[PDB]
Structure formats: structure tokens, C-alpha cells
């Protein structure tokens, strides 16, 4: 349960993540997406904490928290960050770290260091970008240790090497309410496009799931509850191997509510790719498009509560995540129903791009939003199709 202030911040974090997802989906250089609305919101909260006047008020505007005190925002966001660990077993299936990297010359304000550690658990470090290999090495080693190797490299290059770099490294592993059998795993092909396919490992399972097959919009939507039904993972996949652009037009808070109402518990034979999906996003360019124009500009930025010096701007906001799909979950009472209960299951075979969301069941807040377009795997030879499976 959330306080009414944190509950309204949660709705805006979800609406903000929907906007960031759509902005990134337009970009053709973007393949996989992985956003945690609460971690995106906390980044804006850190701008409101270290910023001043327009720089700080724009962060509250982007987060629609202008009609709330600064202390209410930092406490409400600190509350939502702690609620993430509740539905996910903290420090084992869910890991998060936040670090502000300032230039070697810049010294952080002792009051800012205390309040950012208090509300956002933010770490602070100085970094010399003259030696570009040792600056990237420090960032990647920190993100690797934060996620215990699951995210070994945040970025290969830092573009703006003259300001504050905010890095968020995460590891999330959905723990199913009903586990997959560890041996219901095999090698299948994932059609990235109609002409491109990568070799992937897949995990398979048949059970009762809330499901809807939308024949007019040609797509399936299934809800997979996570540990103790405290949150659930929703997957939207088109019927055909197509670019998700079309589904992303329909992906609105209103259509999702409609789709979820049309769902009903049916026997479903789910098959998903198994493995770690690593995604790094620099949200700086997209945050300006949402209203944060002062902080990202070297001349307009006022991060005086952060250091006590202009010429210090939000150079980058890295949102790096390692999202693992695995068989592990809670054990399920085998033979609770039987083979006649799961008789003609609906097929939900995720061998082509799909959109997914992690939703808190109690509050309805969005934990994650993303899409799996290109999983890790080598391109398969087209000539293998000349050799039929008979």
C-alpha cells in the first residue's frame, strides 16, 4: 500500500515511462527497450534535489509534481523505490545502484551527498575523462559489481565528458508464481524480422493464465503472475512477425485497461526466450523533449545545490538494465487440476518481437516497460532451411 502522494507519483511515473518508450520506439537505432518508471522518476527527483529555480522546477513539471513541496517529492519517490524491492526479493532477483559522476575539479556539496543518499541511495564519484579508457573502465566496473556481472558494460563511449553523469545499473529477474520445469528448455529460432532469425534457448510451460486473443487487431495478450501474485508480467505480441510500431500506436493507458478487462483465465501453452537481455539507454536526449531543457544545457543549467558551481550540467542519464528470463519461480502443486483441465491450450509462442510490462498487483504501478526485438544469439544460416526436419 502507498500513501496518496506516492500513489499519484506512481501514475505519473507510468505515464512518463509510456512517453519515453514511445519517444525511443520512433528512433530506428533503438532495438530493445527496458525502462523502470520509478528509476526514471528518481533521476528527475535527483535533478530537483541538486538543481535550483528553473532547473529544479522543470524536473517537478516533467514529473507533474509542481503542486507538491520539494520534500514531498523526495519522500514520495523514496517510498516508491522501497516498494519495488517488496514484490521482488531485494538484492537477489532485483539489484539497483545509482551513481553521480562529476569531473575531477568538481566537489559535491556535503548536504547534497547526505540527502541524495537518504532519499535515492545515490553514490557520488569523481572521474577524469582525459584518460577515456580509465573513465569508461570505472563506470563499467561499478555497474558490473552492482549487478554481480549480469550487466558487464554500461556504455562503450561517453559523449559529453564535461558535466554530471547519472548512471543507474539494474538487474531484474521475474520469479514466476508457478515455475517452469528446469528441463522444459530447448534451442529454437527467434525471428527478429521476416528475413533475420537468431538461435535462442526457449522455456516452455502450460498452465492457467489470464489471456485475450484480439482477432481484429491481430495480437495476443497474456498475464503471468510473479511471486505470491504481488506483481504480474503482461506480454503483448502480434500474430505476425512484424515491427512493433503498429502495436505501439495502440499501446495507451486506456487500451491496456480495455484489454485487461477482456482477459479470462484459460489453459495457455507459453514459450518464452530464456536468458539475460542487456539494455543501455541514454535518456538525456529524450528527457529534453519531455520538458527538462535547462539541466541538459551547459549554459542554462543551475546545479548549485549539487556542487556550488554553474558550468556543471546533466551530461548523461544512463538507464542500464539486465533483465533475465529464467525458469525459476515458486513450486506449484502438481496434479492440482489434471490433463483434461489444460486440454486444448491456446498457443502463446514468443518467437518474434513482443512488448512487455511488469505491473504491481496492489497499487497498479508500472515496475517495468520494454520490448524484446533482438535477443542475444548468432544469426542462423538461411541455407539450413533446405534441410527439412524429417
mmCIF file with all atom_site columns, N, CA and C in Angstrom, residues 72-125:
data_model
loop_
_atom_site.group_PDB
_atom_site.id
_atom_site.type_symbol
_atom_site.label_atom_id
_atom_site.label_alt_id
_atom_site.label_comp_id
_atom_site.label_asym_id
_atom_site.label_entity_id
_atom_site.label_seq_id
_atom_site.pdbx_PDB_ins_code
_atom_site.Cartn_x
_atom_site.Cartn_y
_atom_site.Cartn_z
_atom_site.occupancy
_atom_site.B_iso_or_equiv
_atom_site.pdbx_formal_charge
_atom_site.auth_seq_id
_atom_site.auth_comp_id
_atom_site.auth_asym_id
_atom_site.auth_atom_id
_atom_site.pdbx_PDB_model_num
ATOM 1   N N  . UNK A 1 72  ? 8.076  16.605  -0.195  1.00 0.00 ? 72  UNK A N  1
ATOM 2   C CA . UNK A 1 72  ? 7.054  15.601  -0.503  1.00 0.00 ? 72  UNK A CA 1
ATOM 3   C C  . UNK A 1 72  ? 7.441  14.748  -1.718  1.00 0.00 ? 72  UNK A C  1
ATOM 4   N N  . UNK A 1 73  ? 8.125  15.346  -2.696  1.00 0.00 ? 73  UNK A N  1
ATOM 5   C CA . UNK A 1 73  ? 8.567  14.630  -3.887  1.00 0.00 ? 73  UNK A CA 1
ATOM 6   C C  . UNK A 1 73  ? 9.671  13.643  -3.525  1.00 0.00 ? 73  UNK A C  1
ATOM 7   N N  . UNK A 1 74  ? 10.688 14.097  -2.802  1.00 0.00 ? 74  UNK A N  1
ATOM 8   C CA . UNK A 1 74  ? 11.806 13.248  -2.419  1.00 0.00 ? 74  UNK A CA 1
ATOM 9   C C  . UNK A 1 74  ? 11.378 12.113  -1.473  1.00 0.00 ? 74  UNK A C  1
ATOM 10  N N  . UNK A 1 75  ? 10.376 12.346  -0.612  1.00 0.00 ? 75  UNK A N  1
ATOM 11  C CA . UNK A 1 75  ? 9.880  11.305  0.285   1.00 0.00 ? 75  UNK A CA 1
ATOM 12  C C  . UNK A 1 75  ? 8.970  10.339  -0.466  1.00 0.00 ? 75  UNK A C  1
ATOM 13  N N  . UNK A 1 76  ? 8.127  10.859  -1.351  1.00 0.00 ? 76  UNK A N  1
ATOM 14  C CA . UNK A 1 76  ? 7.224  10.037  -2.140  1.00 0.00 ? 76  UNK A CA 1
ATOM 15  C C  . UNK A 1 76  ? 7.951  9.141   -3.129  1.00 0.00 ? 76  UNK A C  1
ATOM 16  N N  . UNK A 1 77  ? 9.059  9.641   -3.734  1.00 0.00 ? 77  UNK A N  1
ATOM 17  C CA . UNK A 1 77  ? 9.860  8.845   -4.674  1.00 0.00 ? 77  UNK A CA 1
ATOM 18  C C  . UNK A 1 77  ? 10.694 7.819   -3.903  1.00 0.00 ? 77  UNK A C  1
ATOM 19  N N  . UNK A 1 78  ? 11.244 8.213   -2.749  1.00 0.00 ? 78  UNK A N  1
ATOM 20  C CA . UNK A 1 78  ? 11.963 7.301   -1.864  1.00 0.00 ? 78  UNK A CA 1
ATOM 21  C C  . UNK A 1 78  ? 11.073 6.154   -1.413  1.00 0.00 ? 78  UNK A C  1
ATOM 22  N N  . UNK A 1 79  ? 9.765  6.427   -1.221  1.00 0.00 ? 79  UNK A N  1
ATOM 23  C CA . UNK A 1 79  ? 8.759  5.436   -0.845  1.00 0.00 ? 79  UNK A CA 1
ATOM 24  C C  . UNK A 1 79  ? 8.526  4.447   -1.996  1.00 0.00 ? 79  UNK A C  1
ATOM 25  N N  . UNK A 1 80  ? 8.383  4.945   -3.248  1.00 0.00 ? 80  UNK A N  1
ATOM 26  C CA . UNK A 1 80  ? 8.174  4.085   -4.416  1.00 0.00 ? 80  UNK A CA 1
ATOM 27  C C  . UNK A 1 80  ? 9.395  3.225   -4.720  1.00 0.00 ? 80  UNK A C  1
ATOM 28  N N  . UNK A 1 81  ? 10.615 3.735   -4.499  1.00 0.00 ? 81  UNK A N  1
ATOM 29  C CA . UNK A 1 81  ? 11.821 2.940   -4.709  1.00 0.00 ? 81  UNK A CA 1
ATOM 30  C C  . UNK A 1 81  ? 11.850 1.754   -3.741  1.00 0.00 ? 81  UNK A C  1
ATOM 31  N N  . UNK A 1 82  ? 11.466 1.973   -2.473  1.00 0.00 ? 82  UNK A N  1
ATOM 32  C CA . UNK A 1 82  ? 11.414 0.904   -1.480  1.00 0.00 ? 82  UNK A CA 1
ATOM 33  C C  . UNK A 1 82  ? 10.303 -0.098  -1.783  1.00 0.00 ? 82  UNK A C  1
ATOM 34  N N  . UNK A 1 83  ? 9.206  0.325   -2.424  1.00 0.00 ? 83  UNK A N  1
ATOM 35  C CA . UNK A 1 83  ? 8.118  -0.583  -2.779  1.00 0.00 ? 83  UNK A CA 1
ATOM 36  C C  . UNK A 1 83  ? 8.502  -1.568  -3.902  1.00 0.00 ? 83  UNK A C  1
ATOM 37  N N  . UNK A 1 84  ? 9.550  -1.248  -4.697  1.00 0.00 ? 84  UNK A N  1
ATOM 38  C CA . UNK A 1 84  ? 9.997  -2.106  -5.797  1.00 0.00 ? 84  UNK A CA 1
ATOM 39  C C  . UNK A 1 84  ? 10.555 -3.390  -5.229  1.00 0.00 ? 84  UNK A C  1
ATOM 40  N N  . UNK A 1 85  ? 11.395 -3.282  -4.178  1.00 0.00 ? 85  UNK A N  1
ATOM 41  C CA . UNK A 1 85  ? 12.026 -4.425  -3.505  1.00 0.00 ? 85  UNK A CA 1
ATOM 42  C C  . UNK A 1 85  ? 11.013 -5.370  -2.823  1.00 0.00 ? 85  UNK A C  1
ATOM 43  N N  . UNK A 1 86  ? 9.810  -4.870  -2.489  1.00 0.00 ? 86  UNK A N  1
ATOM 44  C CA . UNK A 1 86  ? 8.779  -5.646  -1.796  1.00 0.00 ? 86  UNK A CA 1
ATOM 45  C C  . UNK A 1 86  ? 8.226  -6.820  -2.626  1.00 0.00 ? 86  UNK A C  1
ATOM 46  N N  . UNK A 1 87  ? 7.860  -6.572  -3.890  1.00 0.00 ? 87  UNK A N  1
ATOM 47  C CA . UNK A 1 87  ? 7.321  -7.603  -4.773  1.00 0.00 ? 87  UNK A CA 1
ATOM 48  C C  . UNK A 1 87  ? 8.417  -8.367  -5.536  1.00 0.00 ? 87  UNK A C  1
ATOM 49  N N  . UNK A 1 88  ? 9.717  -8.218  -5.167  1.00 0.00 ? 88  UNK A N  1
ATOM 50  C CA . UNK A 1 88  ? 10.816 -8.821  -5.933  1.00 0.00 ? 88  UNK A CA 1
ATOM 51  C C  . UNK A 1 88  ? 12.016 -9.411  -5.166  1.00 0.00 ? 88  UNK A C  1
ATOM 52  N N  . UNK A 1 89  ? 11.937 -9.669  -3.844  1.00 0.00 ? 89  UNK A N  1
ATOM 53  C CA . UNK A 1 89  ? 13.091 -10.225 -3.086  1.00 0.00 ? 89  UNK A CA 1
ATOM 54  C C  . UNK A 1 89  ? 14.402 -9.412  -3.284  1.00 0.00 ? 89  UNK A C  1
ATOM 55  N N  . UNK A 1 90  ? 14.525 -8.297  -2.547  1.00 0.00 ? 90  UNK A N  1
ATOM 56  C CA . UNK A 1 90  ? 15.661 -7.382  -2.628  1.00 0.00 ? 90  UNK A CA 1
ATOM 57  C C  . UNK A 1 90  ? 17.046 -8.057  -2.592  1.00 0.00 ? 90  UNK A C  1
ATOM 58  N N  . UNK A 1 91  ? 17.964 -7.545  -3.429  1.00 0.00 ? 91  UNK A N  1
ATOM 59  C CA . UNK A 1 91  ? 19.374 -7.944  -3.521  1.00 0.00 ? 91  UNK A CA 1
ATOM 60  C C  . UNK A 1 91  ? 19.636 -9.402  -3.958  1.00 0.00 ? 91  UNK A C  1
ATOM 61  N N  . UNK A 1 92  ? 18.684 -10.052 -4.651  1.00 0.00 ? 92  UNK A N  1
ATOM 62  C CA . UNK A 1 92  ? 18.907 -11.406 -5.175  1.00 0.00 ? 92  UNK A CA 1
ATOM 63  C C  . UNK A 1 92  ? 18.232 -11.519 -6.584  1.00 0.00 ? 92  UNK A C  1
ATOM 64  N N  . UNK A 1 93  ? 16.910 -11.307 -6.699  1.00 0.00 ? 93  UNK A N  1
ATOM 65  C CA . UNK A 1 93  ? 16.255 -11.266 -8.020  1.00 0.00 ? 93  UNK A CA 1
ATOM 66  C C  . UNK A 1 93  ? 16.082 -9.811  -8.515  1.00 0.00 ? 93  UNK A C  1
ATOM 67  N N  . UNK A 1 94  ? 16.497 -8.800  -7.722  1.00 0.00 ? 94  UNK A N  1
ATOM 68  C CA . UNK A 1 94  ? 16.381 -7.384  -8.042  1.00 0.00 ? 94  UNK A CA 1
ATOM 69  C C  . UNK A 1 94  ? 17.539 -6.596  -7.371  1.00 0.00 ? 94  UNK A C  1
ATOM 70  N N  . UNK A 1 95  ? 18.372 -5.926  -8.188  1.00 0.00 ? 95  UNK A N  1
ATOM 71  C CA . UNK A 1 95  ? 19.520 -5.135  -7.740  1.00 0.00 ? 95  UNK A CA 1
ATOM 72  C C  . UNK A 1 95  ? 19.502 -3.802  -8.468  1.00 0.00 ? 95  UNK A C  1
ATOM 73  N N  . UNK A 1 96  ? 19.759 -2.707  -7.762  1.00 0.00 ? 96  UNK A N  1
ATOM 74  C CA . UNK A 1 96  ? 19.753 -1.351  -8.308  1.00 0.00 ? 96  UNK A CA 1
ATOM 75  C C  . UNK A 1 96  ? 20.854 -0.520  -7.636  1.00 0.00 ? 96  UNK A C  1
ATOM 76  N N  . UNK A 1 97  ? 21.563 0.254   -8.436  1.00 0.00 ? 97  UNK A N  1
ATOM 77  C CA . UNK A 1 97  ? 22.585 1.174   -7.971  1.00 0.00 ? 97  UNK A CA 1
ATOM 78  C C  . UNK A 1 97  ? 22.474 2.465   -8.757  1.00 0.00 ? 97  UNK A C  1
ATOM 79  N N  . UNK A 1 98  ? 22.795 3.584   -8.109  1.00 0.00 ? 98  UNK A N  1
ATOM 80  C CA . UNK A 1 98  ? 22.737 4.913   -8.711  1.00 0.00 ? 98  UNK A CA 1
ATOM 81  C C  . UNK A 1 98  ? 23.998 5.634   -8.330  1.00 0.00 ? 98  UNK A C  1
ATOM 82  N N  . UNK A 1 99  ? 24.720 6.198   -9.298  1.00 0.00 ? 99  UNK A N  1
ATOM 83  C CA . UNK A 1 99  ? 25.960 6.901   -9.014  1.00 0.00 ? 99  UNK A CA 1
ATOM 84  C C  . UNK A 1 99  ? 26.056 8.132   -9.890  1.00 0.00 ? 99  UNK A C  1
ATOM 85  N N  . UNK A 1 100 ? 26.418 9.265   -9.271  1.00 0.00 ? 100 UNK A N  1
ATOM 86  C CA . UNK A 1 100 ? 26.630 10.531  -9.947  1.00 0.00 ? 100 UNK A CA 1
ATOM 87  C C  . UNK A 1 100 ? 28.119 10.676  -10.115 1.00 0.00 ? 100 UNK A C  1
ATOM 88  N N  . UNK A 1 101 ? 28.557 10.834  -11.359 1.00 0.00 ? 101 UNK A N  1
ATOM 89  C CA . UNK A 1 101 ? 29.951 11.006  -11.705 1.00 0.00 ? 101 UNK A CA 1
ATOM 90  C C  . UNK A 1 101 ? 30.164 12.457  -12.128 1.00 0.00 ? 101 UNK A C  1
ATOM 91  N N  . UNK A 1 102 ? 30.909 13.204  -11.325 1.00 0.00 ? 102 UNK A N  1
ATOM 92  C CA . UNK A 1 102 ? 31.250 14.587  -11.632 1.00 0.00 ? 102 UNK A CA 1
ATOM 93  C C  . UNK A 1 102 ? 32.703 14.716  -12.057 1.00 0.00 ? 102 UNK A C  1
ATOM 94  N N  . UNK A 1 103 ? 33.108 15.814  -12.739 1.00 0.00 ? 103 UNK A N  1
ATOM 95  C CA . UNK A 1 103 ? 34.534 15.947  -13.113 1.00 0.00 ? 103 UNK A CA 1
ATOM 96  C C  . UNK A 1 103 ? 35.470 16.034  -11.904 1.00 0.00 ? 103 UNK A C  1
ATOM 97  N N  . UNK A 1 104 ? 36.752 15.695  -12.115 1.00 0.00 ? 104 UNK A N  1
ATOM 98  C CA . UNK A 1 104 ? 37.803 15.708  -11.085 1.00 0.00 ? 104 UNK A CA 1
ATOM 99  C C  . UNK A 1 104 ? 37.877 17.031  -10.300 1.00 0.00 ? 104 UNK A C  1
ATOM 100 N N  . UNK A 1 105 ? 37.637 18.168  -10.983 1.00 0.00 ? 105 UNK A N  1
ATOM 101 C CA . UNK A 1 105 ? 37.653 19.504  -10.372 1.00 0.00 ? 105 UNK A CA 1
ATOM 102 C C  . UNK A 1 105 ? 36.476 19.725  -9.402  1.00 0.00 ? 105 UNK A C  1
ATOM 103 N N  . UNK A 1 106 ? 35.298 19.197  -9.761  1.00 0.00 ? 106 UNK A N  1
ATOM 104 C CA . UNK A 1 106 ? 34.055 19.397  -9.017  1.00 0.00 ? 106 UNK A CA 1
ATOM 105 C C  . UNK A 1 106 ? 33.975 18.569  -7.733  1.00 0.00 ? 106 UNK A C  1
ATOM 106 N N  . UNK A 1 107 ? 33.635 19.225  -6.599  1.00 0.00 ? 107 UNK A N  1
ATOM 107 C CA . UNK A 1 107 ? 33.451 18.581  -5.296  1.00 0.00 ? 107 UNK A CA 1
ATOM 108 C C  . UNK A 1 107 ? 31.981 18.736  -4.890  1.00 0.00 ? 107 UNK A C  1
ATOM 109 N N  . UNK A 1 108 ? 31.300 17.612  -4.618  1.00 0.00 ? 108 UNK A N  1
ATOM 110 C CA . UNK A 1 108 ? 29.878 17.618  -4.273  1.00 0.00 ? 108 UNK A CA 1
ATOM 111 C C  . UNK A 1 108 ? 29.631 18.237  -2.910  1.00 0.00 ? 108 UNK A C  1
ATOM 112 N N  . UNK A 1 109 ? 28.493 18.916  -2.767  1.00 0.00 ? 109 UNK A N  1
ATOM 113 C CA . UNK A 1 109 ? 28.110 19.547  -1.514  1.00 0.00 ? 109 UNK A CA 1
ATOM 114 C C  . UNK A 1 109 ? 27.797 18.469  -0.486  1.00 0.00 ? 109 UNK A C  1
ATOM 115 N N  . UNK A 1 110 ? 28.375 18.567  0.722   1.00 0.00 ? 110 UNK A N  1
ATOM 116 C CA . UNK A 1 110 ? 28.174 17.603  1.811   1.00 0.00 ? 110 UNK A CA 1
ATOM 117 C C  . UNK A 1 110 ? 26.694 17.450  2.198   1.00 0.00 ? 110 UNK A C  1
ATOM 118 N N  . UNK A 1 111 ? 25.881 18.507  2.018   1.00 0.00 ? 111 UNK A N  1
ATOM 119 C CA . UNK A 1 111 ? 24.450 18.439  2.316   1.00 0.00 ? 111 UNK A CA 1
ATOM 120 C C  . UNK A 1 111 ? 23.719 17.659  1.223   1.00 0.00 ? 111 UNK A C  1
ATOM 121 N N  . UNK A 1 112 ? 24.124 17.849  -0.051  1.00 0.00 ? 112 UNK A N  1
ATOM 122 C CA . UNK A 1 112 ? 23.534 17.126  -1.175  1.00 0.00 ? 112 UNK A CA 1
ATOM 123 C C  . UNK A 1 112 ? 23.853 15.632  -1.074  1.00 0.00 ? 112 UNK A C  1
ATOM 124 N N  . UNK A 1 113 ? 25.110 15.286  -0.756  1.00 0.00 ? 113 UNK A N  1
ATOM 125 C CA . UNK A 1 113 ? 25.548 13.900  -0.607  1.00 0.00 ? 113 UNK A CA 1
ATOM 126 C C  . UNK A 1 113 ? 24.699 13.174  0.446   1.00 0.00 ? 113 UNK A C  1
ATOM 127 N N  . UNK A 1 114 ? 24.344 13.851  1.545   1.00 0.00 ? 114 UNK A N  1
ATOM 128 C CA . UNK A 1 114 ? 23.541 13.245  2.608   1.00 0.00 ? 114 UNK A CA 1
ATOM 129 C C  . UNK A 1 114 ? 22.089 13.033  2.158   1.00 0.00 ? 114 UNK A C  1
ATOM 130 N N  . UNK A 1 115 ? 21.456 14.058  1.588   1.00 0.00 ? 115 UNK A N  1
ATOM 131 C CA . UNK A 1 115 ? 20.062 13.967  1.163   1.00 0.00 ? 115 UNK A CA 1
ATOM 132 C C  . UNK A 1 115 ? 19.824 13.057  -0.055  1.00 0.00 ? 115 UNK A C  1
ATOM 133 N N  . UNK A 1 116 ? 20.790 12.948  -0.989  1.00 0.00 ? 116 UNK A N  1
ATOM 134 C CA . UNK A 1 116 ? 20.638 12.052  -2.141  1.00 0.00 ? 116 UNK A CA 1
ATOM 135 C C  . UNK A 1 116 ? 20.846 10.600  -1.707  1.00 0.00 ? 116 UNK A C  1
ATOM 136 N N  . UNK A 1 117 ? 21.758 10.342  -0.750  1.00 0.00 ? 117 UNK A N  1
ATOM 137 C CA . UNK A 1 117 ? 21.947 9.008   -0.163  1.00 0.00 ? 117 UNK A CA 1
ATOM 138 C C  . UNK A 1 117 ? 20.703 8.624   0.645   1.00 0.00 ? 117 UNK A C  1
ATOM 139 N N  . UNK A 1 118 ? 20.107 9.593   1.348   1.00 0.00 ? 118 UNK A N  1
ATOM 140 C CA . UNK A 1 118 ? 18.922 9.380   2.173   1.00 0.00 ? 118 UNK A CA 1
ATOM 141 C C  . UNK A 1 118 ? 17.700 8.965   1.343   1.00 0.00 ? 118 UNK A C  1
ATOM 142 N N  . UNK A 1 119 ? 17.310 9.776   0.353   1.00 0.00 ? 119 UNK A N  1
ATOM 143 C CA . UNK A 1 119 ? 16.108 9.537   -0.450  1.00 0.00 ? 119 UNK A CA 1
ATOM 144 C C  . UNK A 1 119 ? 16.276 8.570   -1.623  1.00 0.00 ? 119 UNK A C  1
ATOM 145 N N  . UNK A 1 120 ? 17.385 8.693   -2.371  1.00 0.00 ? 120 UNK A N  1
ATOM 146 C CA . UNK A 1 120 ? 17.634 7.937   -3.596  1.00 0.00 ? 120 UNK A CA 1
ATOM 147 C C  . UNK A 1 120 ? 18.759 6.917   -3.524  1.00 0.00 ? 120 UNK A C  1
ATOM 148 N N  . UNK A 1 121 ? 19.451 6.808   -2.385  1.00 0.00 ? 121 UNK A N  1
ATOM 149 C CA . UNK A 1 121 ? 20.571 5.884   -2.224  1.00 0.00 ? 121 UNK A CA 1
ATOM 150 C C  . UNK A 1 121 ? 21.637 6.111   -3.315  1.00 0.00 ? 121 UNK A C  1
ATOM 151 N N  . UNK A 1 122 ? 21.875 7.392   -3.627  1.00 0.00 ? 122 UNK A N  1
ATOM 152 C CA . UNK A 1 122 ? 22.783 7.793   -4.671  1.00 0.00 ? 122 UNK A CA 1
ATOM 153 C C  . UNK A 1 122 ? 24.202 7.808   -4.159  1.00 0.00 ? 122 UNK A C  1
ATOM 154 N N  . UNK A 1 123 ? 25.108 7.233   -4.937  1.00 0.00 ? 123 UNK A N  1
ATOM 155 C CA . UNK A 1 123 ? 26.545 7.205   -4.684  1.00 0.00 ? 123 UNK A CA 1
ATOM 156 C C  . UNK A 1 123 ? 27.150 8.371   -5.482  1.00 0.00 ? 123 UNK A C  1
ATOM 157 N N  . UNK A 1 124 ? 28.326 8.868   -5.089  1.00 0.00 ? 124 UNK A N  1
ATOM 158 C CA . UNK A 1 124 ? 28.956 10.005  -5.781  1.00 0.00 ? 124 UNK A CA 1
ATOM 159 C C  . UNK A 1 124 ? 30.414 9.713   -6.006  1.00 0.00 ? 124 UNK A C  1
ATOM 160 N N  . UNK A 1 125 ? 30.912 9.995   -7.205  1.00 0.00 ? 125 UNK A N  1
ATOM 161 C CA . UNK A 1 125 ? 32.300 9.719   -7.540  1.00 0.00 ? 125 UNK A CA 1
ATOM 162 C C  . UNK A 1 125 ? 32.845 10.760  -8.519  1.00 0.00 ? 125 UNK A C  1
#
